[PDB]
Amino acid sequence: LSFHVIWIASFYNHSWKQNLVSGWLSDLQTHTWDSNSSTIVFLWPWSRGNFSNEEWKELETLFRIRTIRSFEGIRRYAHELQFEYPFEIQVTGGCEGSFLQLAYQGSDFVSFQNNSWLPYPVAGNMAKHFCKVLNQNQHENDITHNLLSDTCPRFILGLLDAGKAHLQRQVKPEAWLSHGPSPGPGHLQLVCHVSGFYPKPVWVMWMRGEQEQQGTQRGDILPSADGTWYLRATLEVAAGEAADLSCRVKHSSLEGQDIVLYWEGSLVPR
Amino acid sequence: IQRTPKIQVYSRHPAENGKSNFLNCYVSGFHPSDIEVDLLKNGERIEKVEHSDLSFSKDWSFYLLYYTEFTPTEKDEYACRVNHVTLSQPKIVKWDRD
Numbered sequence: 001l002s003f004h005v006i007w008i009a010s011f012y013n014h015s016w017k018q019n020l021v022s023g024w025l026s027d028l029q030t031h032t033w034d035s036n037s038s039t040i041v042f043l044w045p046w047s048r049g050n051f052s053n054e055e056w057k058e059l060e061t062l063f064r065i066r067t068i069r070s071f072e073g074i075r076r077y078a079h080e081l082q083f084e085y086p087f088e089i090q091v092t093g094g095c096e097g098s099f100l101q102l103a104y105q106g107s108d109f110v111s112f113q114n115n116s117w118l119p120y121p122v123a124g125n126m127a128k129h130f131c132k133v134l135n136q137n138q139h140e141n142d143i144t145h146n147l148l149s150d151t152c153p154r155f156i157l158g159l160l161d162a163g164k165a166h167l168q169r170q171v172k173p174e175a176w177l178s179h180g181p182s183p184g185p186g187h188l189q190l191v192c193h194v195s196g197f198y199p200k201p202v203w204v205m206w207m208r209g210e211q212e213q214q215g216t217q218r219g220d221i222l223p224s225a226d227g228t229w230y231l232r233a234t235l236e237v238a239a240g241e242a243a244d245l246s247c248r249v250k251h252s253s254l255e256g257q258d259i260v261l262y263w264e265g266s267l268v269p270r
Numbered sequence: 271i272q273r274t275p276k277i278q279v280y281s282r283h284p285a286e287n288g289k290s291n292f293l294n295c296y297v298s299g300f301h302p303s304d305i306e307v308d309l310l311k312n313g314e315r316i317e318k319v320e321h322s323d324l325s326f327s328k329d330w331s332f333y334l335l336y337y338t339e340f341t342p343t344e345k346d347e348y349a350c351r352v353n354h355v356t357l358s359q360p361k362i363v364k365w366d367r368d
């Protein structure tokens with residue numbers, strides 16, 4: 001559980017850019033920046049947290065001016081910083097513990113530690129030169145420290161409360177079986193699909209009765225448009241050994257009633 | 271440092287001919303963020319496909335979810351077509367269903 005902001009800035013040439021900004025409570029997107037209207041977009045009714053409209057207006061004003069300042073600053077010093085177009089700047093900041101990190105061309109470049117920007121030693125002279133430009137105003141850095149140490153912890157706790165009915169919901173998975181498309185000769189690939197579950201932690205194994213089949217290969221947990229998760233678990237078996245196999249799913253929402261499906265019927269085929 | 275996209279295609283529910291469902295294409299681990307993703311039905315582009323806001327992982331690589339509501343039939347084939355600077359030719363990943 002951690003509140004963080006994701007900032008993506010693409011500088012294709014001196015006269016063209018694209019800025020994308022979003023707020024996150026771990027895997028959950030809670031806010032978006034509208035590049036057109038230059039306003040905060042609340043994705044949930046509880047996204048406003050325990051903060052007021054006046055407090056939100058000042059936060060909005062601070063973000064709007066710092067982005068115009070950032071794009072102009074990077075444009076002005078791109079040559080001295082040895083930034084060659086097209087390039088991308090990524091920033092992530094928040095609290096878990098507090099952090100604020102910046103990448104250039106998808107690699108660690110600089111980070112904010114305590115009250116100043118520190119270069120990543122590997123990023124070399126460019127990153128030292130960037131920190132010189134970023135640390136020009138100490139008052140601006142003190143504002144950054146206070147946002148990370150004071151404003152951020154106050155926001156995350158006051159958000160986890162307002163969104164409690166959402167983050168703690170239990171959504172039951174559904175599962176199904178299919179044939180895998182790339183098996184070897186004399187072998188089959190059995191696939192167990194698990195979808196629609198929330199929260200993310202899940203257990204899925206191919207079984208032979210009570211024996212877990214350790215050839216079970218679990219893929220990545222993938223997102224669904226509705227906020228639930230998906231996972232596929234595959235098992236490579238010899239064609240004459242797919243008998244009595246089942247896929248078993250355990251999830252917090254099921255309260256001990258595991259889902260069990262059997263490699264049977266037209267999948268065998270009988 | 272350029273990173274090629276990983277592309278995973280899946281449905282929200284088991285495939286049932288004539289029942290409404292969601293087709294997903296999760297594209298991840300790529301750099302730079304410029305990417306073209308299309309959902310295909312019988313090799314033709316599906317219009318008005320939705321996508322998640324662009325985000326990135328701890329290693330700074332980007333990820334997106336593309337999705338669309340659809341109704342599969344016995345004769346239809348679906349895929350995800352991705353274009354990126356790291357690919358000499360577009361990569362087509364099929365939706366596997368029994």
Ligand SMILES: CCC/C=C\C/C=C\CCCCCCCc1cccc(O)c1O
Pocket residue numbers: 005007023058059060062063066067069070071073074091092093102
């Ligand atoms: C002149 C060079 C500047 C280069 C990089 C710094 C540019 C932007 C920092 C992005 C970090 C965003 C963290 C918080 C963003 C935010 C989100 C919601 C509300 C806000 O008021 C806000 O500032």
